Structure 1
Amino acid sequence: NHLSIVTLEEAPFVIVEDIDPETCVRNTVPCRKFVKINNSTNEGMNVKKCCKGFCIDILKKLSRTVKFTYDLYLVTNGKHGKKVNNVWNGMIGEVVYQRAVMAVGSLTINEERSEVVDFSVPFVETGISVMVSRGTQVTGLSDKKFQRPHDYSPPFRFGTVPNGSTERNIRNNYPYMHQYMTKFNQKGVEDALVSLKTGKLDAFIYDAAVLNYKAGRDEGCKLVTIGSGYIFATTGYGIALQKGSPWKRQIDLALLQFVGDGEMEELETLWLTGIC
């Protein structure tokens, strides 16, 4: 009944804040982040932090509907999840190696992750989108500018944030495009957005849900997703649970009840709506 839950900061899904002077107030819940003392030790401290957002509100509703208590912590071993030397890091790894009962966040459902963890029903539609400056002509992922980049002089500058589900898919589907674009690897979303606006990058390939959120709140509506905010390889965010977890049935029914009761639309209205 008292479950260990892992999460990761990715606004507006999960937003991390400092504790107020002296705990977590209002729409926020307590989360803990293990912070190292130094790099010549394995010692660290669990800093009390506060968490909010679309995914945190889902966790609150699940907590009262499914009837469970939880201790929320933030992943420090990588991010979302990557299989390095046949070993999983990130939120996926925390669930695979049973350090967490479940993973809640902007966690993309894909085939390789579904072989090692169980995912709930999707609760946010996502996949791959392309963010460009308004007016940029790119048909889609299959555009020659992306597919055969060196046919263009100068070539089109495009990148992603590596080690997530987006880079994985690109690696598997477009080997040549992938090896060319690693030169334009971005540290995070904020870095990528700055790079686009200042003309240092032409396209940013990333998670459809985060890209459409950022496009909607962009100052001057300069940055757009290609097509009608088109999604390639459509999937969803889901709750990762352990294989054969006794929690799945009740988690899926509760999420589907929130969809049917109108609660999901209220969450989309608070957290996800934008101007553009």
Structure 2
Amino acid sequence: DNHLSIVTLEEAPFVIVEDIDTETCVRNTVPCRKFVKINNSTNEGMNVKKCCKGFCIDILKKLSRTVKFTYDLYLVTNGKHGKKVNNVWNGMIGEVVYQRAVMAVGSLTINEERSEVVDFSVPFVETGISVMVSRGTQVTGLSDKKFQRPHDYSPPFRFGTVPNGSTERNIRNNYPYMHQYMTRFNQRGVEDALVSLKTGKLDAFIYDAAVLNYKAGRDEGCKLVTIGSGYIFATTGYGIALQKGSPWKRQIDLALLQFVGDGEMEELETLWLTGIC
């Protein structure tokens, strides 16, 4: 068929989840279901209808029109973006590898490990490992000596990430002592880290560049800022994931490069991602 099972994942502003109602989805939003559990000791649950909107949802809308396909959109319930646990993938990537979805649309980063088990479209927004600080702080990026050998400075920089994801894993592999150092400043989540930065309890927060650009774009008073794009570490992008050898990949790639070259992507960026600062 030209009718596709598509998985997504909530992460504002790329994918934003709302309730229905009248009890349907108003415009800007498309329907997306979520399998909600009865309790934490059963596999029983109920498919709840929700409404999805955002930067990546708009991408999906254009791809559907241009490449001509219909879809059932559903939200991942086990995992987030995609992690191989004991060689068993969860998250959005897991939905694709295990063929419950032919496509994953969202804030899904293109990386080498995932690219061995899924195909990725061209990237539709740039990302990487960036650094956010309070305005005035001087850091060049992840590979700054302030991060690689923190005790070379007095006092040592206080900096961390949100553990258990790609940032921690990348840092653990490239900068073993940095990882050892920064474990003590692990943040529970992105908003926690932003508050830590603004309250002077954290000097830098190391995270996904597109997310950090978006947060700094809309920061109140514009006090939190990121490094320049020239200093993002391990630059890559968000891309759409497809099954291995997918026949949709080529036309998705052409449509996405189309949107980039004709101004459509920049307009979505203006519509969803740019802010005051």
Q: Give the shorter-chain TM-score range.
A: over 0.9
Gap runs ≥5 in structure 1: none
* Aligned twin of 2:184: 183
Segment of structure 1 superposing worse, 184-193 or 246-255? 184-193
Asked if residue 85 in structure 1 is aligned to residue 86 in structure 2, the reply is yes
Shift of 1:228: 5.9
> Hey, what's the Cα distance between the residues in 2 that align with 1:93 and 1:13?
20
Shift of 1:219: 0.6
Shift of 1:165: 2.5
SS in 1 for 2:117: coil
SS in 2 for 1:274: coil
Q: Is the Cα–Cα contact under 8 Å of residues 141 and 232 in structure 2 kept in the other structure?
A: no
Shift of 1:152: 4.2
How do residues 98-177 of structure 1 correspond to structure 2 at under 5 angstroms? 98-177=99-178
Compute the TM-score of the two structures, normalised by the length of structure 2. Answer: 0.94
How do residues 196-235 of structure 1 correspond to structure 2 at under 5 angstroms? 196-227=197-228, 230-235=231-236
* Aligned twin of 2:46: 45
Gap runs ≥5 in structure 2: none
- Name the CA shift for 1:241/1:225 in 2 (closer, same or farther; >3 Å): same
Q: Is the Cα–Cα contact under 8 Å of residues 14 and 56 in structure 1 kept in the other structure?
A: yes
Segment of structure 1 superposing worse, 55-64 or 16-25? 16-25
Segment of structure 1 superposing worse, 96-105 or 138-147? 138-147
Compute the TM-score of the two structures, normalised by the length of structure 1. Answer: 0.95
Shift of 1:53: 0.6
Deviations 1:25-70 (A, max 9, x none): 0100011111111112111111111111110001011111111111
- The count of residues paired between Structure 1 and Structure 2 equals 276
SS in 2 for 1:220: helix
Shift of 1:21: 4.7
> Hey, what's the Cα distance between the residues in 1 that align with 2:156 and 2:100?
45
SS in 1 for 2:113: helix
Segment of structure 1 superposing worse, 245-254 or 185-194? 185-194
* Aligned twin of 1:67: 68
> Hey, what's the Cα distance between the residues in 1 that align with 2:62 and 2:75?
20
Deviations 1:102-145 (A, max 9, x none): 11111111111111110001110111110011111223222233
Shift of 1:274: 1.2
Q: Is the Cα–Cα contact under 8 Å of residues 142 and 232 in structure 2 kept in the other structure?
A: no
Shift of 1:229: 7.3
Q: Is the Cα–Cα contact under 8 Å of residues 98 and 242 in structure 1 kept in the other structure?
A: yes
Shift of 1:177: 0.9
Deviations 1:239-270 (A, max 9, x none): 01111011101111111111223211211111
> Hey, what's the Cα distance between the residues in 1 that align with 2:232 and 2:95?
29
> Hey, what's the Cα distance between the residues in 1 that align with 2:176 and 2:22?
51
Shift of 1:98: 1.0
SS in 2 for 1:115: helix
Q: Is the Cα–Cα contact under 8 Å of residues 212 and 229 in structure 1 kept in the other structure?
A: no
Segment of structure 1 superposing worse, 225-234 or 192-201? 225-234
Q: Is the Cα–Cα contact under 8 Å of residues 140 and 231 in structure 2 kept in the other structure?
A: no
> Hey, what's the Cα distance between the residues in 2 that align with 1:50 and 1:107?
20
- Name the CA shift for 1:179/1:21 in 2 (closer, same or farther; >3 Å): farther
> Hey, what's the Cα distance between the residues in 2 that align with 1:108 and 1:93?
14
Asked if residue 58 in structure 1 is aligned to residue 59 in structure 2, the reply is yes
Kindly report structure 1 stretches of 4+ aligned residues shifted beyond 6 Å: none
Segment of structure 1 superposing worse, 108-117 or 252-261? 252-261
Segment of structure 1 superposing worse, 73-82 or 158-167? 158-167
> Hey, what's the Cα distance between the residues in 2 that align with 1:208 and 1:141?
11
Q: Is the Cα–Cα contact under 8 Å of residues 81 and 164 in structure 1 kept in the other structure?
A: no
Shift of 1:196: 1.2
Shift of 1:153: 4.7
Segment of structure 1 superposing worse, 262-271 or 53-62? 262-271
> Hey, what's the Cα distance between the residues in 2 that align with 1:153 and 1:45?
55
Segment of structure 1 superposing worse, 23-32 or 165-174? 165-174
Deviations 1:75-126 (A, max 9, x none): 1111111112122111111111111101111111111111111000111011
SS in 2 for 1:64: helix
Q: Is the Cα–Cα contact under 8 Å of residues 109 and 237 in structure 1 kept in the other structure?
A: yes
